[PDB]
Structure 1
Amino acid sequence: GYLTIGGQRYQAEINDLENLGEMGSGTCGQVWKMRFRKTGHVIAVKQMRRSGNKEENKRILMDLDVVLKSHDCPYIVQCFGTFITNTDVFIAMELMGTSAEKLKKRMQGPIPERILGKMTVAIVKALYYLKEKHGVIHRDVKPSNILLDERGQIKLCDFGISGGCAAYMAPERIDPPDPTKPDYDIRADVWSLGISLVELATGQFPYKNCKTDFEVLTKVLQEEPPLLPGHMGFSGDFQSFVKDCLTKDHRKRPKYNKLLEHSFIKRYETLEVDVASWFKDVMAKTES
């Protein structure tokens, strides 16, 4: 085994990791929280069993393949290394605090615009990075794929990172202009970002009481885009950013290179926002 962590590279075996308990399983599981005995760093170790589900393993490896290539992107969770035994692969990842989905649940309400500003800057830069550097279109941008930590970091999650959920689907993905060719572009992921931002900013998923996925698709197409409400004191920058992302006609929808010059992103690039303390407090005062 090989870990690159704390600025050094260590030869390591699975025995050098102290198991601190299971974190989760069944999607890109199974995930252990572990401590590296040579340094005291705590990490998340995802285990891919050789006897495990073939569709599950394929997803794990396609995601791992992107993560390994994105070491130079600070907005994407990092892989410290891998251990391959005769029966398993253990994948050592940066351990994050929780997802934005859970954070909305813990808070049972809106996340503050200032935290969402910092979130938008990070996640657009991750997505732009994935498209420009690797040609990857994420296809599943939603709050459960946005991770936050006690260090104040905000990152796009490793899960499904190689490129999802019907609820965040863009109108052109539901109603393709022409299925082939090619399919759709990064603009679909821009729409999903917009939906995620509205959900997080208001505390509620914007298509109300849909009983099925198909019902949300129907509302996406039949209804007006669900913009920030005007009675909540959102800044004009933020509303315009959401309204740009939620442009139903995809041809008129801005790409990342344009979103990155939007006033909402420019302002949040430099605004001092103490995401780490906010996150510690929310995690303190919570759960629900």
Structure 2
Amino acid sequence: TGYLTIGGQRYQAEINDLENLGEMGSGTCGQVWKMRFRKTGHVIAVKQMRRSGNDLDVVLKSHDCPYIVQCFGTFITNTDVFIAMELMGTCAEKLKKRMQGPIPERILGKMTVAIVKALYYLKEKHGVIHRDVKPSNILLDERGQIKLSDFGIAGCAAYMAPERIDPPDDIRADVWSLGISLVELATGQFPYKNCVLTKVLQEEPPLLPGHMGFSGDFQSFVKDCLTKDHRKRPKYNKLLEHSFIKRYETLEVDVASWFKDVMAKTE
């Protein structure tokens, strides 16, 4: 906030001080740059957004978690807002479009661990509900790391839990989005008939195809997350003891390589 913290020290800095190194089209949205903070020598990402009508400052107290993309600070001009954050590879969304094929169970397994531990961290440590868990906001990288990108507070965002129609008043709606995301990448196809998308509350939850060769535990984990009564749908605490997790918690999986390998294409 006119101030940038990296390597565990807080510096005054100014957005215009940074070395722009050219853009990227594929972050949390497509308005993001790659730059360098001259003062420490670090190379970062800088999301740039036009200012609107109108403050969730406390994104930086989350340095603790290795599954949440570090935010270094923020800047304002009379026209835009710049949020500065650690540099990453790409959405899962991109990976899907790019491969036009499914993501392997075992990558999803690591992903799944990482996304849950992230959400847990937020609920516990910061009383947060991410409320926007989808493949666009899950970032992977060259070294094999997988992280949640916390976006703060017609197939356009049909990851909504079916528990959003009984007012008047959040805990585990995030869990449902998780499941949808898993189904989507695991199969490489957003499950639902195109329009809009009201089969959500109609149908039996869109579980994982019986014989694409997924493990039973994966299948289980996905069913559990995809429970129509939020009442019955599991908390993170429980998910984290689900064996799928317990497994990918421990199993060696070369995400680093896979990821690199999947970057043998244009785009």
Per the shorter chain, which TM-score range? 0.7 to 0.9
Structure 1 residue 117 displacement after superposition:
0.5
Sort the Cα spacing of 1:32 and 1:281 in 2 relative to 1 into closer, same or farther, 3 A.
same
Aligned residues of 2:106 and 2:253 also touching (Cα < 8 A):
yes
Alpha-carbon distance in 2 for matches of 1:174, 1:236: 32
TM-score, structure 2 as length reference: 0.86
Sort the Cα spacing of 1:6 and 1:276 in 2 relative to 1 into closer, same or farther, 3 A.
farther
Cα offsets for 1:157-205 (capped at 9, x unmatched): 132369x96511111114569xxxxxxx222111110011000000001
Sort the Cα spacing of 1:12 and 1:267 in 2 relative to 1 into closer, same or farther, 3 A.
same
Aligned residues of 2:28 and 2:137 also touching (Cα < 8 A):
no
Sort the Cα spacing of 1:86 and 1:166 in 2 relative to 1 into closer, same or farther, 3 A.
closer
Alpha-carbon distance in 1 for matches of 2:156, 2:230: 19
Number of aligned residue pairs: 264
Structure 1 residue 75 displacement after superposition:
1.1
Question: Percent same amino acid among aligned pairs?
Answer: 99
Sort the Cα spacing of 1:101 and 1:50 in 2 relative to 1 into closer, same or farther, 3 A.
closer
Structure 1 residue 154 displacement after superposition:
0.8
Sort the Cα spacing of 1:189 and 1:46 in 2 relative to 1 into closer, same or farther, 3 A.
same
Sort the Cα spacing of 1:174 and 1:203 in 2 relative to 1 into closer, same or farther, 3 A.
farther
Alpha-carbon distance in 2 for matches of 1:26, 1:277: 21
Query: Counterpart of 2:23 in 1: which secondary structure?
Result: strand
Alpha-carbon distance in 2 for matches of 1:93, 1:140: 18
Q: What is the RMSD of the two structures over their aligned residues, measured on CA atoms? A: 3.3
Q: How does 1:64-213 map to 2 (within 5 A)?
A: 65-83=57-75, 90-160=82-152, 166-174=157-165, 185-210=170-195
Aligned residues of 1:145 and 1:156 also touching (Cα < 8 A):
yes
Structure 1 residue 281 displacement after superposition:
1.2
Structure 1 residue 29 displacement after superposition:
7.0
Alpha-carbon distance in 2 for matches of 1:88, 1:251: 41
Structure 1, unpaired ranges of 5+: 53-62, 178-184, 211-215
Sort the Cα spacing of 1:46 and 1:176 in 2 relative to 1 into closer, same or farther, 3 A.
same
Sort the Cα spacing of 1:115 and 1:161 in 2 relative to 1 into closer, same or farther, 3 A.
farther
Sort the Cα spacing of 1:71 and 1:209 in 2 relative to 1 into closer, same or farther, 3 A.
same
Query: Counterpart of 1:65 in 2: which secondary structure?
Result: coil
Aligned residues of 1:47 and 1:88 also touching (Cα < 8 A):
yes
Structure 1 residue 65 displacement after superposition:
2.3
Structure 2, unpaired ranges of 5+: none
TM-score, structure 1 as length reference: 0.80
Query: Counterpart of 1:250 in 2: which secondary structure?
Result: coil
Cα offsets for 1:2-45 (capped at 9, x unmatched): 44334555554445421112335999774321023345432112
Alpha-carbon distance in 2 for matches of 1:121, 1:27: 20
Query: Counterpart of 1:19 in 2: which secondary structure?
Result: strand
Aligned residues of 1:245 and 1:254 also touching (Cα < 8 A):
yes
Sort the Cα spacing of 1:8 and 1:66 in 2 relative to 1 into closer, same or farther, 3 A.
closer
**Mean CA deviation greater in 84-93 or 95-104:** 84-93
Sort the Cα spacing of 1:234 and 1:286 in 2 relative to 1 into closer, same or farther, 3 A.
farther
Sort the Cα spacing of 1:26 and 1:71 in 2 relative to 1 into closer, same or farther, 3 A.
closer
Aligned residues of 2:132 and 2:151 also touching (Cα < 8 A):
no
Query: Counterpart of 1:171 in 2: which secondary structure?
Result: coil
Aligned residues of 2:26 and 2:91 also touching (Cα < 8 A):
no
More helix by share: 1
Aligned residues of 2:72 and 2:86 also touching (Cα < 8 A):
yes
Structure 1 residue 91 displacement after superposition:
3.0
Sort the Cα spacing of 1:284 and 1:38 in 2 relative to 1 into closer, same or farther, 3 A.
farther
Query: Counterpart of 1:4 in 2: which secondary structure?
Result: strand
**Mean CA deviation greater in 193-202 or 220-229:** 220-229
Aligned residues of 1:166 and 1:217 also touching (Cα < 8 A):
no
Sort the Cα spacing of 1:225 and 1:26 in 2 relative to 1 into closer, same or farther, 3 A.
closer
Sort the Cα spacing of 1:176 and 1:244 in 2 relative to 1 into closer, same or farther, 3 A.
farther
Structure 1 residue 217 displacement after superposition:
4.5
Tell me the equivalent position of 1:256: 236
Alpha-carbon distance in 1 for matches of 2:26, 2:187: 30
Structure 1 residue 86 displacement after superposition:
7.1
Cα offsets for 1:85-115 (capped at 9, x unmatched): 6776543211111101111001101001111
Cα offsets for 1:44-78 (capped at 9, x unmatched): 123456688xxxxxxxxxx7524212111211111
